[PDB]
Symmetry: D2
Amino acid sequence: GKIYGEYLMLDKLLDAQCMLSEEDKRPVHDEHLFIITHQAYELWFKQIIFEFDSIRDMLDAEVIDETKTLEIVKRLNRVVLILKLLVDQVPILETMTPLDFMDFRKYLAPASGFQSLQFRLIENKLGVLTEQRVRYNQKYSDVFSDEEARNSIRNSEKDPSLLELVQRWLERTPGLEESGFNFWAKFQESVDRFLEAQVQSAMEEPVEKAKNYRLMDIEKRREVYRSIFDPAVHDALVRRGDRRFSHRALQGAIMITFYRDEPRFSQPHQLLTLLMDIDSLITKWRYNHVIMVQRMIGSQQLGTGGSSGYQYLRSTLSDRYKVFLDLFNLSTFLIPREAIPPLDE
Amino acid sequence: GKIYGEYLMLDKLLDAQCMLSEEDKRPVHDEHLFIITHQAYELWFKQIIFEFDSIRDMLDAEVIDETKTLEIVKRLNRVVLILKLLVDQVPILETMTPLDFMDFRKYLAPASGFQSLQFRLIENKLGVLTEQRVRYNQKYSDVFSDEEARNSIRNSEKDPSLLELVQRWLERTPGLEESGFNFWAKFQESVDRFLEAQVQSAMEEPVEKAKNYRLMDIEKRREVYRSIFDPAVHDALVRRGDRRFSHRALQGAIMITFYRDEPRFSQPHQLLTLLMDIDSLITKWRYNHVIMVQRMIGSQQLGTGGSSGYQYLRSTLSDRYKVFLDLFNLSTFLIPREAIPPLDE
Amino acid sequence: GKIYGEYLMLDKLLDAQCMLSEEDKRPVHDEHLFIITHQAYELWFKQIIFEFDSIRDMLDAEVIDETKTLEIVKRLNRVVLILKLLVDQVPILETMTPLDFMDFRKYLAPASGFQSLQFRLIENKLGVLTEQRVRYNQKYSDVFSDEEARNSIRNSEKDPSLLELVQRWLERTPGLEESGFNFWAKFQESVDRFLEAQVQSAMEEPVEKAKNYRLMDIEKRREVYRSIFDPAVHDALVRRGDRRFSHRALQGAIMITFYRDEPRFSQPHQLLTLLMDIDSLITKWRYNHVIMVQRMIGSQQLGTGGSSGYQYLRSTLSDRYKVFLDLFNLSTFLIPREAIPPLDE
Amino acid sequence: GKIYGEYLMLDKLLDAQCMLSEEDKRPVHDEHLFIITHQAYELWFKQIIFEFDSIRDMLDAEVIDETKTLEIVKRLNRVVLILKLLVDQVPILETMTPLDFMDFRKYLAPASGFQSLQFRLIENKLGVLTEQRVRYNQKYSDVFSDEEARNSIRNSEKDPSLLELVQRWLERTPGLEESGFNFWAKFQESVDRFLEAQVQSAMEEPVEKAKNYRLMDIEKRREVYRSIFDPAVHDALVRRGDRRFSHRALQGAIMITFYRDEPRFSQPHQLLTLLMDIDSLITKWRYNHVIMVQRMIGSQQLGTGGSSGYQYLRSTLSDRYKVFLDLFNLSTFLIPREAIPPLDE
Ligand code: HEM
Ligand code: HEM
Ligand code: HEM
Ligand code: HEM
């Protein structure tokens, strides 16, 4: 259409609100808020999926130019803003009293009446690994009984996640080229030179206690650099789940963080930063959600079957559920400006 | 139902998104965001109306006890939070480029494709007076052509607004009773005594310039108190639109602000405070909205017919559109703690 | 004075900014931001302490009337707002690049150059128990070497915390009186009656699987109520650190949450709610802080001595550091409106 | 130093808080908050000035490369975040009751005790023109009596503002070169061609009413383009204060908004966007400030000398006080993607 309500299909949208306590002649005022809050979330979930899918398609290519990079940054930044908004929607629902919630929670399935298809789709499309999930809601068949739902989740798991496609993009970054700039080799070399210089400076320290601390610290630094310079050590950290990136992907990430001030790397950096922001904001939502759940129905209530639901949500707060874990730690491997191999080529 | 998607009618809700540039084989990515943003707004608009109507019904009674007062405070506070959220939704849409918006704005009616029924309902239910509106969108028939829409707006105008019902509630407040506490009389008396004391203190001022400033100020204070103590002056200020409250309503408001620290008046105060917050937040939304409009289509663009739409929105920012204008100014009439007639009875 | 800058002592305040990289002829622009950010925090920390101390003094009395209650609510609400602001200050500092921070971090003591006296004072004044802290920064002497600092922290530990004084206030709440309303006894009775009614309804269930789930659930409910109705079980939960309140304090808390809709209990409830908000916001700050630290210097960097600092901060995120832990769980013990003993007396 | 409190000069910073109602044996609790709130503002004001000055110095050069551009974007973005924070500090102070403020406002000079040197410095450094200010506080000598203050304000007025330096930068943008890309000429040409095409399409319209609206609209579009293509019309709009940019600066701005999707223009665009954000946020602060003032002391109170202070603040809300007014309107001159001259050279 052309008129507001026809274009936005408001006749459909605003007829999707059925208060179950109302049609059962025992009306609870706040049930209206409950419905609207979730529906607002669900609309935004759909937008997030829509942005995610379009970024997946753009990343599923051999060449990502500067122009498409900007478009991705924009869309990731948009998701960040939506996520902040979703974090702030929780205190609106927290405004309903526990006793009011109790008077209509009976109209809801114990665990099925609280699980969102779209949220699970967001997790998978972002890159939450199935094996990283806790035992409780690990298999999606146990969570969702519907058939069309199962097909979507299966598709989300099999299809390339945002985690996978970012890794492939990270592997192709210019500068890791042995033939060209050869950053990894130059990096190792400057780590050796910088650390050597550090040992000599520490040996010249007048106070004995200060010498020992610096020597101990330099040794702890060697162990850090061993975990990135020895591919065997890295692959081990991947297998136990302390890292997620392939070795070459981490190489790309580290290079980006190094030259982030440089016009050629500023946008790739921004992309990574927004990836972290998204991860962190999802965690922030999780935290707010669990505080609200506990505020409403404690750790356990009638019909809840004990405290396993609460304990599950509390365990989703762990780094096991963070998709871009490697990104948070990248400054661990950082050396000062002077020691970084200059960009010339 | 009992399962998430059945309860929230997600099959209806998530089938209300029709991108018109998509079905016309010229797809603009950001059109999806455009639709979702408005739909999120519309869902919240429905919640605001739902909260407003329930407050209207509660206020449409001769006796409002302490218990129902708390429930009203809660619901007004809920509306405040929703409004803050709606203010923060604007920068999400501002993330779409003007050039992208240009590629699908043709699918929208020039002024009809931007006017929301529910928003207009919120304005009227809150208490925006029709005569206070600017010439442009004053008559609702010119704005909305639909029949069911016209009936709702007509009903919103005729039915008691939040402004009306608050006034009636304000008129009944205990303490304005000549037989009882007789606040208005005690107030006048203490104004006289306080002002008298101020004149004498000013006459004793050593510096001549300081004496004159204080004497001029006391005269400006008399004029202030004349505008509330002389009903003729008040009624005149109502007629020209500088005030909205009846004389007795303003008397109630002023008393509440005076004893706001007192347990018996703290909730009535909170109610008034949230009324102001709501007004101010609607203004804050208006401001953000106009900045976004100008960011997208400037003051005027192709098909827009010049700059009358923009100038209209810019004029909605005036105090003519604020419903609880009297509330913002109440501290003008304030006298210090010592001069306020103590609560005894 | 009377003029802005004299009153606010701006000559002192704005002469407290000494960039150490500047006077050492190697200036880092962002060091100015680093200083200002902390100084803004420190000013707010002082305000929080000032509000806390005044609430401590008000609670350190046998009778807290309705009027003083409102004043406490106001001041706790003020602290909430300040805390939200402090949470939002982190992304401002996150705007400094790691490489820029590296160029001036040498001017700072490894662990001493990051520890705030006032923050530690806030923790203790709120009620963080010393034994609940992790091994790393448990004893304040190891943290702070200064003499005046040690005296303040010692005073904060020995003096009655906000946790202690709230408990005493909770113990005195009217309604726990055996002679009067006798809530605890009435509560036990209605738990028995409600649970009995639940067993009979479960026995009448047609489906066998549904009968068993409900019977298992009712058994899990008995265990919940045993932990509050048997003082021995409660005291055990206190000793291991799962609870903090005395038995009578928890009794008070539970009663408040039950009749929160009632004018006489709404403010006491609000007080408890703000206590939770404060706790949660401190946790939210902790989370943001740790994300920023990792963004700047990873899990470990040169001079840092390995990853013990990072791991410490990450462990401050546990419920061991939450002061009002009991408050978060109160809805666990909730029974529906009908089953709650009515207020008559 | 190396320890937290020595580095941050906390002994100086935390000794700058003198409550005047306290030393005069009539203590008002909230006076502490009043002081801290302003001091927090003042610290941030100093940071804003510090960021502004460093951007001024960077822009005061003939060549601004891609690298320095990024640094400017970063610092403008930092100012945006600080400004949002400052907007959110107002509701913290709004938490003090009017009656409490009344009990210590006597210790403050009527207009001098509310004027901030640093704020005035921010306004001038950003680019608020002296002639654009209202009569009330137009001359700084009338506002500030101190000598060192007068010298700083004089220096801020004479020295190149952020407005001036951005204009010069805008004038030099590559693409306005007649010898090179020649954007202005290509732009005029494509406006003619696009408008011609619009007339023909309008003439072919079946409905007569629709033909007339489109013809009227095209005429309104010609008037828009006349105001930018005829330098005489532009210069007139500058003189009356509807525009601020020189003709060539506006040419630069318009080109940037056109090719904002292009890697070469994305950062220059971002710079302009943040300039608008800063302007708008200052306006948002102004609005919040005036609402708070009215909440505390109404439109006028004892000692205030009538309502001129309030009316002044309310007039600072006009576009006369917006520095980058031209930037808000740039989409007015926009033509669709197809009609824009492609970047080749
Ligand atoms: C009265 C308010 C609410 C309560 C008591 C509540 C309770 C719960 C509980 C107990 C679970 C665990 C499900 C299970 O047993 O397996 C859960 C999961 C979830 N909830 Fe809520 N919830 C509330 C509001 C919301 C809102 C407003 C949203 C926004 C869409 C939401 C989104 C979710 C999502 C996405 C999950 C799955 C989480 C995961 O698997 O990590 N909830 N909720
Ligand atoms: C590309 C983004 C947008 C543009 C260009 C835009 C433009 C406009 C224009 C030009 C008007 C005046 C209508 C007239 O000519 O009479 C208007 C009114 C309105 N708009 Fe928007 N708008 C946008 C987004 C939104 C969003 C996201 C909402 C949220 C529901 C919204 C809500 C309204 C409302 C409620 C009115 C009526 C205002 C009143 O009468 O005071 N707009 N808009
Ligand atoms: C470049 C930015 C920052 C870094 C790298 C940083 C790093 C750290 C580290 C490593 C610790 C642990 C101290 C230890 O080793 O024992 C710490 C503690 C702390 N930091 Fe920061 N910090 C930063 C900014 C801030 C800011 C802006 C504040 C606000 C006042 C702040 C407040 C604290 C407080 C209060 C503690 C003690 C925490 C506790 O004991 O639980 N920090 N910081
Ligand atoms: C009880 C709270 C406050 C009241 C009643 C108040 C009142 C005023 C008044 C009446 C003016 C006009 C001055 C004149 O007469 O010429 C003013 C100006 C100003 N105030 Fe406040 N103020 C308050 C809090 C603040 C705070 C927290 C800040 C933050 C630094 C602030 C910053 C300013 C600034 C920067 C101006 C100059 C504005 C301009 O010239 O456009 N004020 N204030």
